[PDB]
């Protein structure tokens, strides 16, 4: 449980928590309310864990990307500033903390990565990523390196991966599309390959993290680093005479850093919601409040207009905002944590040499998108049950001996499924590409998609789909069928049914019947293993649908 009559605040450790605690002391002086600031490790993970049980701080500080997830989980109080207060902050910062039309945090500052470089070791920093290797060779002969930045967190490598086309979630019709993820497109592969190539050629070391990079830059051992405004303080106190500039380009295109809005949310379980509102609105979100934090660790371009107008003259803030304008503001959607973990694993494995770039990004694509949050496999699973129940009630099927019923579905279930998948517009262009011999799989996936298209161009209607399913079901090509002749006559009834239908319904297409039948050879060519590989591997593993379908047919 959370204590009433005081404020507990959690903010990351690379931020200026001592400046923020100073604002807390001023708040305590005026109101007598104790304000305790803390900087726990991995608090973006810690907060949802403890807040789920009604515990944690009253106020949480983080970039806006993890707040939509928090609000979905019911962990954040909706904030309600008066219009007069909202007008003090730039509208696009309010957009970053709006979720399902509800403001769920107070925006504080806009932070973006810039190229930080040592002016004494590099008076003119490289405009392109492609210059780095030659620059590193040149500098290595003087005891120094060209570039060192944190390779453990994907925040810092994203700018390059996104430069040529990498993206997380596509912005489409005014909202982010969780179906459309761009982590394994050609551009993302190009960016991550260049990064990995820097490590193979020993221009960078895969083990580098925040501390190694910052120590190296501030000691003068490396000419360049990549970091946000929070890191400027330690360079000020160090010997280095530094600049802040545009990130270099990749393949002629700007690096696209993911822009964060440092935000402060109120715990949904806090009994001090009004106190937190008073603290944030009247004490922190002021020129004086922000300056106290900014003098500890620079916040970036602050959301408070009055104070942003002063800071704006800083060349380093200008560089920060120029890089931000080249990138994109992160989505705040719940799926961002899936994305960030997916890319985290990808960059570490690729940079270590464990996996290849293509393999690493393939897996990140699967994780970030989760089979459209596993909804496609869910639709496919429904179509599978639909397929069995269809056959069971198909005319003349219930009167078959059970061995003949099983034999027919053993061969034809996959064909009926494909007909259902076309009819149901099951998304196949998505190409899950879920591996567990390559072109071959890919060839059959394209043949699967192309056949469904051919069914579309035929404009096969619901009545024809019913007939085609029956014609495929009653096939004498099945094995072990008592009275194969009976099944031939059942297929003929369905054949005649289609003939009578098309002759009446499409008399101007005298060839439609045979045309429709000519789609059946492609139905059988779709292997049942391909259907399992793309939809049911996660659910049934090695087990063959055939066996499972027999169970369904002979369960009841």
């Amino acid at each position: 449980k959370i204590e009433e009559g005081k404020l507990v605040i959690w903010i990351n450790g690379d931020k200026g928590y001592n400046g923020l605690a100073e604002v807390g002391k001023k708040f305590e002086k005026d109101t007598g309310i104790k304000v305790t600031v803390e900087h726990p490790d991995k608090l973006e993970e810690k907060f949802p864990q403890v807040a789920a049980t009604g515990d944690g701080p009253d106020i949480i500080f983080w970039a806006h990307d993890r707040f939509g997830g928090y609000a979905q989980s019911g962990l954040l109080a909706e904030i309600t500033p008066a219009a007069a207060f909202q007008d003090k902050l730039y509208p696009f910062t309010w957009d970053a903390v709006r979720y399902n039309g509800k403001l769920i945090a107070y925006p504080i500052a806009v932070e973006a990565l810039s190229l930080i470089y040592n002016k004494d070791l590099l008076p003119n920093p490289p405009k392109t990523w492609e210059e780095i290797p030659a620059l590193d060779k040149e500098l290595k002969a003087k005891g120094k390196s060209a570039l060192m930045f944190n390779l453990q967190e994907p925040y810092f490598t994203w700018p390059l991966i996104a430069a040529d086309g990498g993206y997380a979630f596509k912005y489409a019709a005014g909202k982010y599309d969780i179906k459309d993820v761009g982590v394994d497109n050609a551009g993302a592969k190009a960016g991550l390959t260049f990064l990995v190539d820097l490590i193979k050629n020993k221009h960078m070391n895969a083990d580098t993290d925040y501390s190694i990079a910052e120590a190296a830059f501030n000691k003068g051992e490396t000419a360049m680093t990549i970091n946000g405004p929070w890191a400027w303080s330690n360079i000020d106190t160090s010997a280095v005479n530094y600049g802040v500039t545009v990130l270099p380009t990749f393949k002629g295109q700007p690096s696209k850093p993911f822009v964060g809005v440092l935000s402060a949310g109120i715990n949904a379980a806090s009994p001090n919601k009004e106190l937190a509102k008073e603290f944030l609105e009247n004490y922190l979100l002021t020129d004086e409040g922000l300056e106290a934090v900014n003098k500890d660790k620079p916040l970036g371009a602050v959301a408070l207009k009055s104070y942003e107008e002063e800071l704006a003259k800083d060349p380093r803030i200008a560089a920060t905002m120029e890089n931000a304008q080249k990138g994109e503001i992160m989505p705040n959607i719940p799926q961002m944590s899936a994305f960030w973990y997916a890319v985290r694993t990808a960059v570490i494995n690729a940079a270590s040499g464990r996996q290849t770039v293509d393999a690493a990004l393939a897996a990140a694509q699967t994780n970030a998108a989760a089979e459209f949050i596993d909804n496609v496999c869910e639709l496919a699973a429904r179509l599978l049950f639909s397929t069995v129940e269809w056959a069971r009630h198909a005319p003349f099927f219930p009167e078959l001996p059970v061995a003949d019923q099983v034999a027919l579905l053993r061969l034809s279930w996959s064909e009926l499924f494909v007909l259902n998948a076309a009819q149901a517009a099951l998304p196949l262009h998505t190409a899950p590409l879920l591996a567990a011999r390559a072109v071959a799989f890919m060839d059959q996936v394209r043949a699967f998609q192309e056949q469904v298209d051919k069914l579309g161009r035929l404009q096969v209607d619901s009545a024809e789909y019913g007939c085609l399913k029956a014609i495929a079901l009653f096939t004498p090509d099945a094995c072990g069928l008592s009275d194969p002749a009976h099944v031939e006559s059942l297929q003929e009834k369905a054949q005649v049914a289609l003939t009578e239908y098309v002759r009446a319904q499409y008399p101007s297409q005298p060839q439609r019947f045979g045309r429709l039948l000519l789609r059946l050879p492609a139905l059988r060519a779709v292997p049942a293993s391909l259907i399992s590989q793309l939809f049911f591997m996660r659910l049934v593993g090695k087990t063959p649908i055939e066996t499972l379908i027999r169970d369904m047919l002979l369960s009841g």
């Binding site: 596993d374 496999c377 869910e378 699973a381 429904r382 599978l384 049950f385 049911f536 659910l539 049934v540 593993g541 087990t543 066996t547 499972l548 169970d551 369904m552």
Partner: peptide, 18 residues
Amino acid sequence: DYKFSTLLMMLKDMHDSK
């Protein structure tokens, strides 16, 4: 909410339990 996915999972378990 993943109904037929779990159905399919029950069929798998039923089969595995033999």
